[PDB]
A paper describes a structure:
Transcription initiation is a major control point of gene expression. Here, we determine crystal structures of Taq EσA bound to an us-fork promoter fragment, as well as a complete RPo, refined using diffraction data extending to 4.00 and 4.14 Å-resolution, respectively, allowing visualization of key features that stabilize the upstream edge of the transcription bubble. The results also reveal functionally relevant holoenzyme interactions with duplex DNA just upstream of the −10 element and potential protein/DNA interactions that direct the DNA template strand (t-strand) into the RNAP active site.
We therefore formed a complete RPo by combining Taq EΔ1.1σA with a duplex promoter DNA scaffold (−36 to +12 with respect to the transcription start site at +1) but with a non-complementary transcription bubble generated by altering the sequence of the t-strand DNA from −11 to +2. To stabilize the t-strand DNA, we added an RNA primer complementary to the ss t-strand DNA from +1 to −3, yielding a 4 bp RNA:DNA hybrid. We crystallized the resulting complex (437 kD, which we call RPo hereafter), collected and analyzed diffraction data, and refined the structure using reflections to a minimum Bragg spacing of 4.14 Å. In RPo, good electron density for all of the nucleic acids included in the scaffold was observed. The extensive protein/DNA interface in RPo buries 6300 Å2 of molecular surface. In RPo, the A−11(t) base is not stacked on Y217 but instead is about 12 Å away, flipped up alongside the σ3A−3.0 α-helix, sitting between R288 and R291. Indeed, the upstream edge of the post-translocated 4-nt transcript fits snugly between the RNAP active site and the distal tip of the σ3.2-loop, which contacts the upstream RNA:DNA bp at −3, and the t-strand bases at −4 and −5.
Residue numbers in the entry:
A (entry chain D): 2 to 113
B (entry chain D): 509 to 791
C (entry chain F): 324 to 438
D (entry chain D): 1469 to 1505
E (entry chain A): 54 to 157
F (entry chain E): 2 to 94
G (entry chain C): 2 to 56, 62 to 1118
H (entry chain D): 1074 to 1129
The structure:
Amino acid sequence: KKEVRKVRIALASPEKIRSWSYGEVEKPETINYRTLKPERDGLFDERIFGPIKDYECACGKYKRQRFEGKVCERCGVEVTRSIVRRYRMGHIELATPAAHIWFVKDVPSKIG
Amino acid sequence: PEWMILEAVPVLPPDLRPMVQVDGGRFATSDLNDLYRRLINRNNRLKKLLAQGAPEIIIRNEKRMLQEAVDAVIDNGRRGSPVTNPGSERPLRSLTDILSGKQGRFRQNLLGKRVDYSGRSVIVVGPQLKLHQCGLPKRMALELFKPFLLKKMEEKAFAPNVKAARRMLERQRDIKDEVWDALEEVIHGKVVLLNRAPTLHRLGIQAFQPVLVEGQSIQLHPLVCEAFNADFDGDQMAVHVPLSSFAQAEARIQMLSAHNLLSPASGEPLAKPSRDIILGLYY
Amino acid sequence: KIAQEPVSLETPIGDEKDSFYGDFIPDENLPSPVEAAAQSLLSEELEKALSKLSEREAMVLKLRKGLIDGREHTLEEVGAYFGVTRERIRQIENKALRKLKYHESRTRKLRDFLE
Amino acid sequence: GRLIPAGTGSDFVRFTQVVDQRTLKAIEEARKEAVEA
Amino acid sequence: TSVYIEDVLHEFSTIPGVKEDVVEIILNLKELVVRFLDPKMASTTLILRAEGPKEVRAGDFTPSADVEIMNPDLHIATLEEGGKLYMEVRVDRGVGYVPAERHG
Amino acid sequence: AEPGIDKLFGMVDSKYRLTVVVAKRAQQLLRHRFKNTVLEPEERPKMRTLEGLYDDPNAVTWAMKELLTGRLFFGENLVPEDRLQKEMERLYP
Amino acid sequence: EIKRFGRIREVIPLPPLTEIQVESYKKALQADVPPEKRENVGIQAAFKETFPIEEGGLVLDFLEYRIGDPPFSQDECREKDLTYQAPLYARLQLIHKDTGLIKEDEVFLGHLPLMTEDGSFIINGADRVIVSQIHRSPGVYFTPDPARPGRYIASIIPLPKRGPWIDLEVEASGVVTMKVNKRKFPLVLLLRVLGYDQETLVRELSAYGDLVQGLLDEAVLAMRPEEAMVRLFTLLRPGDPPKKDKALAYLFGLLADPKRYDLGEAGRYKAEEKLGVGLSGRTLVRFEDGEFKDEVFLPTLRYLFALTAGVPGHEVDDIDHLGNRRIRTVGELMADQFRVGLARLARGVRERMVMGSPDTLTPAKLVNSRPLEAALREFFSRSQLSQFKDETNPLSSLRHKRRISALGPGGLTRERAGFDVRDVHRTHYGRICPVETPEGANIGLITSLAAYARVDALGFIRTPYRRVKNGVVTEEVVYMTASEEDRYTIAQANTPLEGDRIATDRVVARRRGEPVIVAPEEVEFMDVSPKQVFSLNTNLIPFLEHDDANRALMGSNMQTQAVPLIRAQAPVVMTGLEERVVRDSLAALYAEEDGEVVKVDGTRIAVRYEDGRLVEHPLRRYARSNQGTAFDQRPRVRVGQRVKKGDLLADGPASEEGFLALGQNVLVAIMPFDGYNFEDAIVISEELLKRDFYTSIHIERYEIEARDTKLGPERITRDIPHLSEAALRDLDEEGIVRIGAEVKPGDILVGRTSFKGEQEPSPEERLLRSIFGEKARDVKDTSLRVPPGEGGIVVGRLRLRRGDPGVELKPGVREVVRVFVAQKRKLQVGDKLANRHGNKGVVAKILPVEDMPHLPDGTPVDVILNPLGVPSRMNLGQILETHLGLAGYFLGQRYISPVFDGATEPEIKELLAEAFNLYFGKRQGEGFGVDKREKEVLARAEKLGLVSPGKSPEEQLKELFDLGKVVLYDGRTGEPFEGPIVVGQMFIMKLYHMVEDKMHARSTGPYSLITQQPLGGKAQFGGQRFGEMEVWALEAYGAAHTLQEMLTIKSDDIEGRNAAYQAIIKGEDVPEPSVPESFRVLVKELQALALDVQTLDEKDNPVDIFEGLASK
Amino acid sequence: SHGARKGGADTALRTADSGYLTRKLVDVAHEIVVREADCGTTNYISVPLFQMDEVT
RNA sequence: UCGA
DNA sequence: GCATCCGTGAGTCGAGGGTAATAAGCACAATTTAACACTTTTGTCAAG
DNA sequence: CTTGACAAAAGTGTTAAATTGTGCTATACTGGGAGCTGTCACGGATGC
Ligand SMILES: [Mg+2]
Ligand SMILES: [Zn+2]
């Protein structure tokens, strides 16, 4: 709805990454070897990144576009287009805060 | 500046780092997934033995491992031996690995791209062609212009609607004369771009009028063959079709091989008598 | 079969160091440009062929197949708001169905979409 | 993936207008329609 | 125009007791001149039965009305001992050169 | 080539301006399906086909031949873009 | 008939070409060699070195290995997709040191792929091949100092990975340092453990004068080996505390250990003779009595100081020199992987010994498959030297096996390739072909073994040279390596042989590669035949001396691209080497003894030999290959007749009668024709298509797999829910296409039925299902349909279902069906064509037989090439091929003109003279005379001075004829050409590339999963890629919406291609795109790096490019 | 063949360096487009038609 | 690893 | 300042062919999922 | 279109059968390991 003539690149604060994040992926799993469904906290989890099928909720209680955007009460997924799994990012909270290696090993090291 | 030391590590969406099974019952996945996996693993184990009150040595070492894991996710191989899947030499491609590089998201998936409505083939001499004309193989041209031909089959009877003509063209290639003429009904007046790699001079791409002709070979005018650097030893040339009337306007006007004559480099003529022509006109 | 592990998309190819793996994998989980106009054409032509039915039965059909609220309506429900019995709704949609079956055999517009 | 700053997408030539006589005089007449409004 | 053998599914598959393969014989099949004595005859069919250790030829076909061969010495295929062959062709009159791929 | 291309290049300063003109005009010709044309019957560009000779369906060529007469008008910020589409899609279906 | 030119006769025939594959693989095999007398090198070398295994303690010792019979024949391994291999049963013994428990039980190792007769392995059912490798041989070397303008630098190198490069360069402060694996240290602290102390160093060091002090240091010359052993250990590896035993168990390995240090036999031997010393093992030093010895550093320092003392006989040797470079043969590489695999297994034994039950364990429990079998499986499949065999024709493979590459593992890479490796050294000569090599970035990187070139077991290549004693040719032929050759002075095969003695007093000869005129006295050697200086394909080019190196290279390289033709004919003028070619290629069936043909039977050619027993040879007729090119053997023998041993029976795809035939001999006319031959293009007579000339036959494999899905299993049947009856036609019963059927693109070869993953139909789709009442069954149609651009009949069908005998199918997969689809491709418009002389082109507008530039006899020309390409390319070989062919068409005899030996202008002109004398004879004899048009041409031909004036038109057309030029009448008009046109028989080849394959295009289709861009290439059925420079070009034209569309609408844009497609379908103008997709992907990717990237508008306010998706 | 094939390799490498210079030329001068009809500057340079032949 |  | 070390590149489109490999083991609690007995709707039929 | 009688489809509750997660083994075991070379030009940080 607006012309974009400008693009800025800047540093992202931890709070900003928190804002982007729909959840913290904890379980270092992909999918169960049987169900092939995204694991609970797994990196593919639908409960955060969104549904694999368009508007079809994970557990399957909500299906069509009728109810839209409303998070279900079972799996906790949102009912929306499956496209979201492309644009929706998570986060991992580190116990000991680490450093972005770019600024460390950059030729004119910025921290240094 | 303290943002440079990061607490919460951003995680790329599933479809950006996909895992999907192909035909044959296989499974395929991105390396970024494995990287993230080891990262979060070390992180959780860390938190576990940390809050547990384990000895400082193991804790510290785990912190170090967390740092190098984070680095493995950010830029892999930037420090020390790059992390590789067990048994295999190939390093895991991380974020920075994807961004930068010859095949990086810019030089590969941005500054150039694979496009629809296009194809290519071997080239053959154009002695009957006049300049802006180019031989375009029937077969190639039909499937190339399919979205247009569908409309011209919509207007011109024979099948009731789009889907009809579609299925008519797909299965059972009858290619009734009706479609050979209808194709030309949507063709004439519009020109397609012809490209010869390498593209060095801008003249490496020139607008040419499609002419439906037999054979699977593409006919090109002998004069502009000099500009393209092309010959026929079996050289191959690309064909693209401008869609919107705007792009078609640009094509027919300033991209036309007939409308570009002099060399944009030296200002002198580009396509002139060459080889045979010179020989005869001399003789 | 379960023993084997997934294969990286960063897998090289033959003599060429440049050639990757995942660039060979198509996206079938997203509608193809042809499928968009396909479903569009279906949803359109169907609506055109729907208008030849009684104001009730035509509505009842799309209420039954979920072209309205996106959900199936049991005969009980379709008859509840119409005041009619379930059996009535049943006969209604049957009759309407075959009354469509008359026009379709003629126009041959929707005789496509046969997969 | 936007319109290239150069070429026909140049801000110099991209604001060009095109009108045919009859329509031009239609909108030309539409001007005096607002003077009584 | 066209040919048929009972032992042959295509221009490749080998016939027992025949040195020449199918398309190798077909190479010499179109080299056969057959004159139509009948001006009104647009079609015909030639019949051949050759068994045992004999070398077949053009003059070995089944002679019929309104057809004759100007080169009976044209070699079709060699047949060894025990090799048996049944062949039938179909001949039409036309103009110029029409490739096999172009005609059904 | 396209007949009158030298003249067309001569009609405007930048060739790109010409391209923009032809593009927009062809667009307009597609919108109303040739019923907005400034061309008379003998002026109508015609494509010859075995079935019959009809008006050339290509809109770009139509725009070319159109501006060739100069019966059209062009320039930067000529008229408000607002009313430009209001009385355009009005006059023709 | 036939005819041959040239004086020089090869005194030796070309030894079998396949040997370097098979024979050198044999030495590493020793299959029929008894377990006793085995050579100990190759297979046993990788064996004996990996034994014994020692670490209450145990020693595992080696005995022997059994060569297993092949589990399946070479044929069956293909159909089954199984590697062609055989069980290797290893014999060893488990010996308890202290317990005195001796338990000997023979065990099993794994399967080792064997080699066929032609020297091609079969891996995964598709036969592949292993190319030879090239690297400078091991040993020690001496080069001038790169930095220092002064004295020189020595070096010591082992086999690849078999030890560190040991370098020593005298630093100039006047002192000396030694560099091995990026580090610095004087020689002064080295020899302490080598048995040389302060005094032992300075003794004969003074023989070189000023170089003594180079090695002296008073700090380290005090201390003794055990004290200074840890000294260097704190330097090269400061990754752990400098313990005294830690320098004992570490540095020992880098030298004294025969395993982790193995210096090649060639290296040990050559360095032994070049240092004027001797060496015991393959190590640098010996480990004995707790200290170390030195057999290496002492002689290498001796020679370094020698050369730097300027003493004659000690000098710098060239690096790229072929005497300093060896070849890695197939067997050598085989052992090279075998040893490392066996080492991984050697440590597979270690940890196996330290657990379980140390009391009684048979060697059966101590031995494993994996650390070897996987190491062998990793090699043949994924090694850069092992790849798809070239089956495009027999000569294709025959040459492919003889190629030498400096690339691959152990070799070099394109990034490091310099003019040194790319150049042809002065000593190349008859060892390596100076011309044949790729025209790409691989120039000089991949060469071919020269004709008479042979590689011994040491890797050094040598060429046959006949010795000569006082101008007398000795019948003794010698194989001399590069240095060996460099000693003597070698004459030329073209030297004036007077009948076994030298004739003229000026003899062409060289030394080291330096051409000199040499007296009949000083000449000690001469090369057998000039043919040895060139490889196979290069040697297959007649009049090679008249073609530029470039075009010759191109032609010889193109002979590999050759495809078999059904009617294919042997060349009129050939070098005469085509005989041995089809033989050593083993593509043809000859007589093993002196027999008689009992029956022809183009399946079974049966011959009873002199020994009385009948041996029949079956035929492979009409079978596939790697390139699709059909392999066909046409029996040339009558129902009965006598056959001597070695005489040909069947034929081969490229073979006519036993002569290599690539393309066909046709009639070429050199003249520009209506601009159609413009820029090396080619026009062809339509009369070719009628005569089935240049018509080939190609087959293709199509396979399909039905597995068991999670949703449910799959099966191969004829039943499909929605299918139309007409398509099921050619499928007999089980749902497969039957033999000899007609399959057009889009038709189903093999039906597959798979239960669809579901969900439900959309409301509109569901109602549509209600109208017709048609139920969509669970299972749907996965059937494999023949891809577009290809199709034809079916010569064969291969059915393999799991649970069947002899076939083990991959886990979770039920059925696999593989159809062979063959097509007869006739020469088309735009198809690649070439001759042996390096002249390329495609087919431009085949012209009707009606209009052709024919001759007086009314016989039209087959091709009409364009002369323009000739003077630029400087290939006159095609001119002479045409000239000889012109005579060959009449005289009816072929010709043999060997490379740098053969026909000359007077001889050829004589042939044309005879040919004309007969031709004009038939003319006047048939009741004719000189044509008025002929006069019309002869006039102007006389005016320009082409023919001598005053002579009758007989003599004029004669003088014109032998020139190669004749009178030509234009078929279009019928009036002749204003000047004469050289014509004749040229051998022309139809190259691989064809339009039927290379053609392609797309509207809408597959898109990548990562980004929404299509998939480049014909396979995926995608669209072309728009390069960065194409983009640049579009920017240069200043076409905004063209480039914009390229970057969005037709490439990655989500709704761009969709709304566009709908706009075109509805007859509208496509709207303007919004989001590139992959740009957004780029954005989120950046966000993963914690880069905050915002799109502002004009005012610096954020705009959502994700269209309200991730907003949260 | 000694120097010939060498020349082949020469052209081979230089054709690779060609893109090396090209793409960088593009990446620098890319933003250059004709904007103003006239920049309106008095600034200029001359172009000597005569070149000095050294040592002559 | 070939085609241009 | 002057030698050395680390970092970054290096040409364009295609054509193909593609995928190897696991030495801990057992007992039991915790859920999860397939099994199954019987309920409430839903769809269909006959006659009105 | 309506009223009642019924088969089949779909529901709902409890249970049998799998699948999955957790724990412990007490003779004494106390610092890994694999290495790989035949670039090349340049630009900046770092060290003499
Ligand atoms: Mg070319
Ligand atoms: Zn839910």
